[PDB]
Amino acid sequence: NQALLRILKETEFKKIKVLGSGAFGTVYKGLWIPEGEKVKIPVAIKELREATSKANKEILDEAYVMASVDNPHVCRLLGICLTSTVQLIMQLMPFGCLLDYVREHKDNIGSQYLLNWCVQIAKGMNYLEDRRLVHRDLAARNVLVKTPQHVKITDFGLKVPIKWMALESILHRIYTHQSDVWSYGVTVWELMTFGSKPYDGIPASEISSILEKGERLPQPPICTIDVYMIMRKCWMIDADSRPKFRELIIEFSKMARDPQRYLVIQGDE
Numbered sequence: 001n002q003a004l005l006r007i008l009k010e011t012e013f014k015k016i017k018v019l020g021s022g023a024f025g026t027v028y029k030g031l032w033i034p035e036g037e038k039v040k041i042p043v044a045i046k047e048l049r050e051a052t053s054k055a056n057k058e059i060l061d062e063a064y065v066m067a068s069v070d071n072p073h074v075c076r077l078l079g080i081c082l083t084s085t086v087q088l089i090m091q092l093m094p095f096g097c098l099l100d101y102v103r104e105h106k107d108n109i110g111s112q113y114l115l116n117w118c119v120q121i122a123k124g125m126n127y128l129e130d131r132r133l134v135h136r137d138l139a140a141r142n143v144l145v146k147t148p149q150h151v152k153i154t155d156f157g158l159k160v161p162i163k164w165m166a167l168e169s170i171l172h173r174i175y176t177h178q179s180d181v182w183s184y185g186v187t188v189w190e191l192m193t194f195g196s197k198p199y200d201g202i203p204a205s206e207i208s209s210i211l212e213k214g215e216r217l218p219q220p221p222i223c224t225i226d227v228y229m230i231m232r233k234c235w236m237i238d239a240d241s242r243p244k245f246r247e248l249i250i251e252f253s254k255m256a257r258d259p260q261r262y263l264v265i266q267g268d269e
């Protein structure tokens with residue numbers, strides 16, 4: 001369904017400010033100004049670093065998939081511009097990434113917000129699973145905040161993220177929906193610690209020995225045992241014993257209906 005992806009001319013979008021950068025390239029805030037319309041749409045523009053050598057046709061095939069996602073908790077690719085570089089255009093998410101949001105707001109985040117984010121992320125991942133798409137890089141840095149209670153997963157379809165990876169991904173490069181569930185458990189841990197770094201100060205090459213010994217990320221103080229047990233189930237060595245995203249939607253939706261029962265936040269009780 002080609003109509004879902006706009007092939008953008010260079011005149012149709014303008015990079016105005018920098019949103020962030022790294023080894024991957026640079027993201028800009030700017031405007032999409034479609035020719036023959038009368039509107040200026042706020043967008044993010046991710047310009048990937050120029051590659052020395054896939055051909056346009058293969059890139060467009062993947063971009064068509066990214067433009068085909070239709071779920072309120074998964075970012076959709078709106079347009080692409082292929083030149084010497086690949087530029088990806090999508091709606092601007094004004095509050096930025098969820099990791100930095102929770103760090104910035106760590107004294108002002110309630111239990112219902114936290115649990116709602118867990119529901120929304122599980123819904124987006126369950127959608128990707130229904131589409132037979134494996135994310136491979138779920139993390140709080142790859143959830144974007146459209147408004148404080150509407151978040152969306154980004155950076156699927158595109159430094160190995162060892163500290164978010166299932167053991168079978170580290171050891172055998174196996175990536176499945178169930179290794180995404182492992183990353184989901186780490187992502188929830190990031191939210192419940194208000195953005196702490198997992199395994200802080202531990203070299204990436206030491207993580208597999210931690211997991212092999214049965215050690216895991218610690219129980220966040222605000223988490224009751226019921227919430228931590230979900231997170232621990234996501235880190236089982238047996239991938240098929242981990243929760244499914246459809247079960248995680250159900251369990252976190254139940255907790256979000258009684259948030260004070262399940263998280264004990266600063267000032268509660």
Ligand SMILES: *CCC(=O)Nc1cc(-c2c[nH]c3ncnc(Nc4ccc(OCc5ccccn5)c(Cl)c4)c23)ccc1OCCO
Nearest residue numbers: 019020021027044046075076077088092093096097141155
């Ligand atoms: C947690 C740190 C961080 O990520 N900081 C950055 C935030 C943003 C950013 C801020 N507002 C945004 N709105 C919209 N998009 C982005 N970023 C963004 C991420 C991915 C992609 O393309 C990939 C993709 C598109 C569609 C579907 C699936 N994948 C785009 Cl186009 C835009 C926003 C930007 C950069 C940040 O820093 C990066 C380095 O830390």
